[PDB]
């Protein structure tokens, strides 16, 4: 009621005043001395031409050689990027898929979509074929992004404003986080696999804590739903790409927005965001049929990766950084370098 | 310049590619109908003849149909609506008799205007199903439509009311050339509903076929 919203409001603008006071200068002023990275040239080293429909997501294996891509035709394909081979072809139960994952050990891959079920597939089996190991249910909304903490714990973000941390062995949620007021559409874990962040549809990104479950910090400043989020390799920062043709990088410790990556020519939204090995280059896959590599410290476009026929809906960078993969709404993948 | 294991792996990849191509060709013959509605419009009545998205499979006249009912996917519709871009047709069901109050014709109009005038479904022909004919007939026999339609100048008989509903809902659209909207009164207890759906699917299939040949 009135008094409750009253102290909520006074605490909120006290928080914003504290954030403003703790700010003295943006990093553009201090880092203007450093040189720009210069032009970046990208050549399509390989092309992967197996799918038949739209491509929604893919993940890079820890070996930085195998990647698994999910497409609307209900087929999970595990590629060998070095030779463009097809290690496996997994026929999904429900052809509607909106996310994919690859376990760090390489044993399991995860798939999920409009069925609100995050199924787990087992790769290395004595029988020689790929079969489901555990089908997780309990979500009242569509799955958005599921990621593997390790071989036994998987954290998934759904569309019912809830992010959940599952448990493969038992099969039920060990902890459920719920602070958002809109659909949660993307997920990303810190390099230490202790903290993770989620991008909701209410222009707010929250930082969670997997140990007990509670929102450590709330980050806002966008003007539309956030479609993808990704951690800085340092683990003390992250970048968000919303639907208003902007990409912003936040600081976990400072608890404040830092940079805005926007240009007049681009008006389409952002579908995926990922960094490089050193984090110098911020890659974002727009809907204008191409990506755009952004200099993460000078907020200047360092090049364009334009080779696709439809909207780019996914992106990924290997652990060693030797290659970057994109998958657009045409049934293609490209391994740039 | 490939070792034995590399050649065997390439052979396995080619076999997988052949299987994928065969399955994709088989699935290309499928017809995908997206089913929508107001919830209590009577989609159960439509789906009778044959925790998330429910897929219904049925075959008529040597043709396989794959109808999807979004149903309990109560979330931001615009975020997952694009997954259905490229469906053969869209079935919209609205209850004629549900004009009493809590008015629902206005909610159905809002849903229809939001769905038809969507950037994704620009060319996908929308089929409109009007059901509960007897209940609506009894209701108009009792009370007129001025409760829902203050700007009504017509007869207090079911045929003119149904015609008004049909022309209004057809006028709800904007792109009258790039999109085709069908209509049918589906309260008859026969197979006419599936025949009408088949005819609409045949028309749209001919339309897609005319694109590949370049005759457009």
């Amino acid at each position, epitope marked *: 009621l009135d008094q409750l919203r009253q102290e909520a409001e006074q605490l909120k603008n006290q928080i914003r005043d504290a954030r403003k006071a703790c700010a003295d200068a943006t990093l553009s002023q201090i880092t203007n001395n450093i040189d720009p990275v210069g032009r970046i040239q990208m050549r399509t080293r390989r092309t992967l031409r197996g799918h038949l429909a739209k491509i929604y997501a893919m993940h890079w294996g820890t070996d930085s050689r195998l990647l698994v891509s999910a497409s609307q035709d209900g087929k999970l394909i595990i590629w060998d990027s070095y030779t463009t*081979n097809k*290690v496996h072809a997994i026929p999904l139960r429900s052809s509607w898929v909106m996310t994919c994952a690859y376990a760090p050990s390489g044993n399991y891959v995860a798939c999920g979509g409009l069925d609100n079920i995050c199924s787990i597939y087992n790769l290395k089996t*004595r029988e020689g*074929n790929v079969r489901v190991s555990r089908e997780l249910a309990g979500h009242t909304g569509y799955l958005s992004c599921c990621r593997f903490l390790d071989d036994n714990q998987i954290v998934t973000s759904s569309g019912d404003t809830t992010c959940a941390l599952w448990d493969i062995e038992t099969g039920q949620q060990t902890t459920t986080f719920t602070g958002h007021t809109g659909d949660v559409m993307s997920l990303s874990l810190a390099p230490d696999t202790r903290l993770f962040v989620s991008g909701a549809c209410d222009a707010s990104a929250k930082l969670w804590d997997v140990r007990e479950g509670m929102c450590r910090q709330t980050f806002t400043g966008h003007e539309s739903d956030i479609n993808a989020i990704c951690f800085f390799p340092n683990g003390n920062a992250f970048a968000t790409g919303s639907d208003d043709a902007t990409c912003r990088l936040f600081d976990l410790r400072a608890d404040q927005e830092l940079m805005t990556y926007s240009h007049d020519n681009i008006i389409c939204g952002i579908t995926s965001v990922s960094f490089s090995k050193s984090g110098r280059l911020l890659l974002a896959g727009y809907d204008d049929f191409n990506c755009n590599v952004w200099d993460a410290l000078k907020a200047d476009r360092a090049g364009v990766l334009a080779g696709h026929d439809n909207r780019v809906s996914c992106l990924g960078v290997t652990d060693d950084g030797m290659a970057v993969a994109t998958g657009s709404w045409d049934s293609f993948l490209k391994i740039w370098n | 310049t490939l*070792s034995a*294991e590399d050649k*065997a*792996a390439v052979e396995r990849s080619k076999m997988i590619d052949r299987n994928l191509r065969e399955d994709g060709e088989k699935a290309a013959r499928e017809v995908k109908l997206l089913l929508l509605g107001a919830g209590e419009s009577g989609k159960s009545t439509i789906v009778k003849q044959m925790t998330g998205i429910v897929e219904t499979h049925f075959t008529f006249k040597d043709l396989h149909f794959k109808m999807f009912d979004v149903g309990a996917q109560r979330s931001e519709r615009k975020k997952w609506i694009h997954c259905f871009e490229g469906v053969t047709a869209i079935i919209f069901c609205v209850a004629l008799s549900d004009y009493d109050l809590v008015n629902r014709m206005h909610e159905s109009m809002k849903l229809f205007d939001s769905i038809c005038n969507n950037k994704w479904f620009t060319d996908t022909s929308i089929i409109l199903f009007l059901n509960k004919k007897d209940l609506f007939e009894e209701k108009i026999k009792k009370s007129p439509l001025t409760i829902c339609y203050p700007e009504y100048a017509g007869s207090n008989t079911y045929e003119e009311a149904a015609a008004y509903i049909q022309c209004q809902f057809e006028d709800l659209n904007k792109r009258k050339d790039t999109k085709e909207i069908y209509t049918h009164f589906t309260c008859s207890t026969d197979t006419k509903n599936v025949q009408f759906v088949f005819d609409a699917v045949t028309d749209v299939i001919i339309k897609n076929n005319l694109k590949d040949c370049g005759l457009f």
Partner: single-chain antibody
Amino acid sequence: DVQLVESGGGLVQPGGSRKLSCSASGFAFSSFGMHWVRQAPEKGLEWVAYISSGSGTIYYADTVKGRFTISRDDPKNTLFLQMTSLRSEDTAMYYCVRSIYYYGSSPFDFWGQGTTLTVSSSDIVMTQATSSVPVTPGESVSISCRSSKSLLHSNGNTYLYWFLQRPGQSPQLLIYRMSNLASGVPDRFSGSGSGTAFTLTISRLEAEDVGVYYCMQHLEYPLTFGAGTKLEL
């Protein structure tokens, strides 16, 4: 679980046309590459034939090329081997090796039980040097295998396998591609080496490890097995 049973053995006069059949159950037989390995009684192993998945590739050993026929029956999960004009040297026990080829896969992971047959009266040469090395439990032993051609392919992976045959039954895979460990084997075994030089080291040996050891190549067909190093005590 995975099972491989073969039948068709016995006694036959030279020049016959006996057929050998192997049946499998417990795995997706349609996506596996089949092999055949024979063993003369007081000898080592040697390749016979091989048919890939889908029956698309069929090879043979030059010793029996043109006289032996390979064939698989996917719907019935059965593997057939047709023999014609048997010679007196063909007296050996035959196996039903399985293998599946993809990146990171481990071929020759399982070996069939084996059936015996008796008849009345450019390749890479592998030398295993010693043939019998007495060993004692609690020690660290090393087995050396040598090859003629360089086994390090351009891809960076050296194609060579190891095989242990305990006295009495079929052999089992130990190490594939000279460094990786087979599934289910204890951590005790470990292998390394270089081009044309290969050593398998068994630190802290105990029982259950007695038997013969076989080193095999896979770089080009035909495959050739080593003479064998035999352990006891």
